[PDB]
Structures are given as C-alpha cells and as structure tokens.
Amino acid sequence: YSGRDSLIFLVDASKAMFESQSEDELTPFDMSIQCIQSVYISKIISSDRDLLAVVFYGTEKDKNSVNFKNIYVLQELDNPGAKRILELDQFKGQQGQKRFQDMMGHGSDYSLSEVLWVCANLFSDVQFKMSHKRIMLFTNEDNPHGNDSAKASRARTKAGDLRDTGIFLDLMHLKKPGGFDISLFYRDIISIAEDEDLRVHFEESSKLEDLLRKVRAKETRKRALSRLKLKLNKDIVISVGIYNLVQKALKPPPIKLYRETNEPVKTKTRTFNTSTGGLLLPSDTKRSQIYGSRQIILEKEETEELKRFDDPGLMLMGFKPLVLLKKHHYLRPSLFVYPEESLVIGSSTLFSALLIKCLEKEVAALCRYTPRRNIPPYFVALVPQEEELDDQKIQVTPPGFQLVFLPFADDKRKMPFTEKIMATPEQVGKMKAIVEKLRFTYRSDSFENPVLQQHFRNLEALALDLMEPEQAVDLTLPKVEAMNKRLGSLVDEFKELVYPPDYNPEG
Amino acid sequence: IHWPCRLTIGSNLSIRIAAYKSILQERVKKTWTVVDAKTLKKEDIQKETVYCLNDDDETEVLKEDIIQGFRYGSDIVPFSKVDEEQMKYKSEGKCFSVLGFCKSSQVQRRFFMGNQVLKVFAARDDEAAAVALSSLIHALDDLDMVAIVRYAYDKRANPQVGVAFPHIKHNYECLVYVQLPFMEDLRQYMFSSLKNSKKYAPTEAQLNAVDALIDSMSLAKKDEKTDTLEDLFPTTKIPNPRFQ
C-alpha cells in the first residue's frame, strides 16, 4: 500500500433531500454535511497528507472543467484544512440551507453519467500517486432515472468503466419517506452488493454512525525501522527487518512564529570566540573532561570513535530457556523481527525453521544487537511469537520474533533493606474478596491519553473559532463512586483487621 | 530517590508506600565540554541562539516577540504559551490509584512501555502499611492477578496507566510497576503467515538440523542432582563496555 487515499463526497441537491419527516429531526442534507465535516476533522488529525473533494449534483449552477450542466464541484482534490471546514459550516443550519439554495439552487434535473465523468476527471487531474480511489453517494432516491432508460444505461456503463479503472463506489443511503430499495437501480452501480444489503431499508445506513465517530489518533503506515543481518556465524547470514509495534505518541512539535504577522521565523545557532569575536565551526573546538584534578583533551572525531565496537546487525550467541527471562527486568520497549527476502534469498525458510523449533523447545535466541554504526552493542533476546487470530480470522498477533532488551550490571540499582512482615490468612482472604469485587477485563486499547486528546480538541477549537473547546472524558480516573458502592462494608472490616484504632493513614 | 505516595483503592482505603527505580538505562554522569583548541579553556567559547525572519536583510527578533504555533492541516494555527497553559489538561499530581484488577494473562510483556521499572514497598518505619501491602501482594499472587493503576510523578508530569504485579521472595516482598500503552501508541501492522506458506515450508532434514543447532548451542546447564538450571552466560552481570 503506497500512495495517498482520495475521496469524493457526492451529495444530492434534490428537493426530496431538503424535507424533514419530523419537526425534531435532521434533514438528509444536514446529516451529509455533518458527516463530511467529521471526516474532514478526522483526516486532519490522522492523515493530513490525504486528498478530499466535495461535489454537488442536481443544482442550477455548474462549475467544472468540462462545463456540464447542473454539477457544481464545490471543492477539488486537495489536502484538508480549516478553510474548507469553515466553508462547509455555512450550510449546516436552516439559514445555511437558504444560503446553499441561493448560491447554487435545487430542484433541477441531472444525469449520473455526467456526475461519474466529472468524478473521473477530478481523479485524473491529481498528479500524486493514489493508492485508493473512492466515491461516496449521499442520496435518498433509489430510482434517480425511472422515466428514461437510456440515461440509466449510460450511468451503468459509466459506473462499470469507473470500476474497471479502479474507483470504488459506496452508497450512503439516507432516510426516505417510503423506503430505500437497493435492488431497483443501485445494485449495479455500487461496487459491492452485500447479500444483507438487498432488503428495503427504512432507516439511514449504518455507515453514517461510523463516519460520525471522530477518530483523533494519528495513523502511521507500515514501515521498517531497520533492515539488518542476522549472523548465526561468520558465514551464515540472513536478512531481517525490525518494526516497532508499540511507539510512544507525542504532540506535534511547536513552530516559532512572529508576533506581528504570524510569519514563521528561522532559528540559527552559532559559536564565537570571546576574546576575538570570530566564528568557529564545529571542528576547531576540542572536548575536555576533568578527571583526577587534571584536564583530558580529546578531539570530536576521537570522541565519536569511542563508540565503535562492531558492524550494525544482530549476532547470534546461543539459546536460553524462557524461564530464565524475567518480567521485572524490563529496560526498553520491545521490537518485532520479521524475515526480509529482498536482500537475501532463503532467509524465510531458515527463519521459519528457527521459529518452529524455538516454539517447540521453549527457548529464546540470545543475540548481540547493534542498530546503527558507532553505537555500543546491547544484549537482546528474540522470543518466538506465534500467529494468533481472533474469532473473525483477523490477525491479532503476527508471527515472528520479539526482541527484548536485557539490562547490564549498571542498569540495576541497589534497594534499601526492609524487614518482611507477613499478613495473617484472614487479612489475605479479606483482600482477596476486595480484589474479586473489583475485577475487570483489560484490553490494550481501553485507554486514551488525556493530554493528546485535550490538545487536539483545543487546536480544533482554535482553528474553527468554536465558542468553547470540547471537553474530553478521562477514562483513566478511578471510579470512586462505583468502587465504593461495590465494595460495601469490606473496606471497614479490612481497616479494622489491619490497622490499630488510632492510625490516621492520611496524617 | 525515595518517592512517597499512597496506594488508594477507592476513597476510603489507602496504604502509605515508597517507590524507587529498579531498572533503567544508565548514562554517563559527566558530559563532554567544548573548549577552545589554542588556549584550552571553556571561558573563550560562547554559544547563543538568535531568531531572524526569512527576508533578504535577515533582521533579528527578540524572544519577547516570538509566539508558539501548531500545524492544523495545510495552515498554521497560532497558540500562545499562556493560552496553552490556560487550556492545558490539569490533574492532581502525585497520584497512585488502583483503576482495577485484571488477570495476569491479559497483560503481556510485549506491550510494556516507558523507560523505567518501579519497585513499591511499604512506607519506612510503618507496620500497618507493611501488613496491608503484604496482604495485597499475597492476595494478588494467590488469585494470579495484577492491578491496573494510574501513576503521576507530580503536577507537571503527564498521567500514565501502568500495571503493578506482585514480587515475592524468600526474604522480601514488594510490587513491581511498569507502564502500559495507550490506544494511540499501539500500531496495527499486518504480516504474512509463515506456517501456511507453500514456498517457505521447511523440510524434515532442515528441522532436524535446526534442532541439532539449538541443542548444541545451549547456554543453560541442567543439573539433575538439584534439578536446577545454571546460566553459563549471565548477561545481567556484564559491565557495560561503553564505560569501560
């Protein structure tokens, strides 16, 4: 998967789309606008390098390269930004609907062939490589052309041509007074006709709920940190790739701006002599360190050369039982090692054999690891990792090796000596009861970083000039009320059984 | 440095605890100092940073006329530092709370994050706290479960969600705390399956050769008299070659 994903939001501008079934309900047009805005915000937060477009059909005015009738391309394929969101915001309400009607109009005819032609033309203009081509149809008219059959045939032919080109088509059908029926006309235009998507739907599509669900977490495409060589010995070498399945998420780096006109500035660092005033490059100056009441002077090149031990890669040392590995010896986040057949042919077979035998014998490969040049070596353990799938066969644990760093003698710290006091069985039983009362299931994606979420919310509020920032609920805060209700009296019994009458833990 | 805090389970149970850092990546105590080649003095070298605009004159601007900004899509949104502090996420610092308890199986080592391991003992010169912590540790070990907890070093430190699991030895017992990942940190990468590959399937002879290699290169000796494993190559007892 290489390139960018392009999406086009086709929104019908027919009269039937501007009628609300109930007074306290959202019109289909407003729902489509809200979905587009949500997708825009999600793309800005997650993938800012993607391309989006917004096109309307069935209007009175037109704006397109080919100069068709009743097709107004509101926004062409361009990276998302706050300006487009603000522009779309002027159609959200009823006054926005009036503004949209005045600007473009509604109630005119249209031909789906022209719409698809305009979409294809928009796709062709983009110069960047596009991994995905996608179009979404926000409409509530299952029979766009019932009076004319030639128009339907032309639309079918254009949809087929687009499908052959490699353009995905999706139908976000909206509520209809009568009921949407895909079988009428949209069975062929839509790229994939699901078996369940054949009955008459009396409610908006379920995909709108997914679209409205804002995702405020960055998405990174698969990439290899390094492509190194595993050396069983001097003459047996295979090629492996290293990946970081877990990586800390950081706020985007701040940028320095000028106060007067918000124009970015450039920061430069320089070093000058005090007694002469001249400028010194980072080669005239030396390095120093005061040991034993004396000064030791080393050049920069020598200082860098102090760290040269061995060439980059992994060197095999032996195999160790997994029992000897310790959980509390954590030093650094682990990495993932996978075969890489491009550099060396035959690496995959040996890697698979090693993984199978390591799983069978429950052993881990001890290795010496050197990520880059002029970096001191470390001792790592490659633990086999089998392929684990979930109920729906979606892979949850890939096959390969888990690279875990092992601490040196300097990475451990001595602990103060503390006398051991053992609790009586009754206290342990009461604590067991409390623990059982406070039991819950844990998942790796059950928590979110409050700082990053609040930062994203504040940034969006500032960019869109919203009245107040949206407040993010913190799921990491203990539920004091629920815990108190569940525990009941157990806390009092434990405190009576473990603490003297006058202890005052807080004090 | 001894770090005092209170392990809280709800709003009525609290145990005074002291936390230390057990495992961390050691660094050099002293750093190289830049000196002048001729006089060999640090007083003759001065480093300073300046800011200038992207103009032919490259006019300089003082630090009082410099604002912060961020990238929101295709445009830059100003965000002054004072406004950022006004809108920053505020939390009560120095918290050690028990979010819940979960089976040790659910928490896997491959998900461990952070750059340190914390060892939590009872407060010094405190018997009731020691009894409470021992009860908690023994209950967790007997039930084979760990505690998902929220940890914050201080007011300025960002909150973290981590796992505390018991550590019992013949002479001392304590809790071991290691950070856990957030939803953002997780990465979803898809890799092909090697078991069901018709092109990389090992043969019987290849598997036998790999088995022989694994058996011959064993780094542990199994003494049958004591039925014990002895490590022929202890990595944890090797000084770092960098400092040497």
Partner: peptide
C-alpha cells in the same frame, strides 16, 4: 474484509475506548 475503517483504508477500525467496566 469486515471491520475495515471507512475513513482510513488499509487500517483496521478501532473500537471506542471503554475504560473500566466492572463485571
């Protein structure tokens, strides 16, 4: 390929974080 993220093709959709839900 059920569960694929509509917003981001090629990435598996992630369920909303539920925090702690006692049994």
């Amino acid at each position: 390929c059920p569960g694929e993220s509509l917003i981001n093709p090629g990435f598996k959709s992630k369920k909303p974080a539920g925090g702690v839900d006692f049994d």
